Symmetry: C3
Amino acid sequence: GSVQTAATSWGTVPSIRVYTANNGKITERCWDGKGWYTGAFNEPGDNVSVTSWLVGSAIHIRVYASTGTTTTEWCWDGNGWTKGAYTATN
Amino acid sequence: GSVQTAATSWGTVPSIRVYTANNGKITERCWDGKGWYTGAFNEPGDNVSVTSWLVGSAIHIRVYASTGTTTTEWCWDGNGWTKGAYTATN
Amino acid sequence: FGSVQTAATSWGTVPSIRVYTANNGKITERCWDGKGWYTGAFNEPGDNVSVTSWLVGSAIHIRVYASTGTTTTEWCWDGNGWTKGAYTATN
Ligand SMILES: CO[C@@H]1O[C@@H](C)[C@@H](O)[C@@H](O)[C@@H]1O
Ligand SMILES: CO[C@@H]1O[C@@H](C)[C@@H](O)[C@@H](O)[C@@H]1O
Ligand SMILES: CO[C@@H]1O[C@@H](C)[C@@H](O)[C@@H](O)[C@@H]1O
Ligand SMILES: CO[C@@H]1O[C@@H](C)[C@@H](O)[C@@H](O)[C@@H]1O
Ligand SMILES: CO[C@@H]1O[C@@H](C)[C@@H](O)[C@@H](O)[C@@H]1O
Ligand SMILES: CO[C@@H]1O[C@@H](C)[C@@H](O)[C@@H](O)[C@@H]1O
């Protein structure tokens, strides 16, 4: 069983975030121009996808974590990770 | 056993599209700033990836749906989903 | 089981698109730059693939994350061939 990843990036430095789903847990590795480091994101999930956008210089990230038929959205809007309004009927 | 997702976003509202492959079928959930809703995208596939770009304010989306070794590209260019020219090998 | 897994990225307004496919332990690349699909130079081992890219004016930079077991290897395109990146899962 191999891990499954998702990646996003922004700006010109750039900043990169790589999410890895491994044995039901999703963790995050970060690059902001110095070295790679472990990010704050840690949520359950067997599958992960991500998207992000800038509002000026501020990054907004949405991570979609799935276990079984349930996908939970996690939001970064500059202060911390919060559960989003995303729902689906899988 | 878990569903597999792909996500893309555009602009600063933003608009978000999340594709979910579940039991051989891909469906789409949409956000344009005022609640999640079910999109028009419905195509076969066990795996999904997506990318998108803007030309001015017009969004263009490409969804890559795979079953076995066959990947089919689906195109949104502002006027419905159409099958794209993408081919792989074999 | 038996289905390939893909990752895609795009840039500009032509556009250019790159689609990476992990099939039976090998990752390959298909390219579009407005004039037909062609096979790219990317060829690395892996069971899973993800990608991200960013433009610096007209210059594309791509990072492909190829995984086998718990090891993810980053591959870099900065205009001059694919090179192994500094990404690691732990310090
Ligand atoms: C500043 O915090 C770091 O960057 C944010 C954009 C998030 O990726 C977070 O999980 C990470 O720890
Ligand atoms: C403001 O709402 C938050 O951000 C939107 C862009 C969506 O991700 C939504 O599900 C989330 O709750
Ligand atoms: C207006 O239509 C909605 O947005 C488009 C960009 C597509 O995602 C389509 O499937 C969806 O129903
Ligand atoms: C113009 O051609 C259409 O759009 C391009 C950006 C590609 O996705 C191609 O496969 C598709 O048929
Ligand atoms: C010009 O070379 C083509 O485009 C580059 C941006 C890379 O995707 C490379 O693997 C591909 O063969
Ligand atoms: C300059 O460093 C290269 O590019 C950065 C944006 C990262 O992808 C890093 O792992 C890689 O080695």
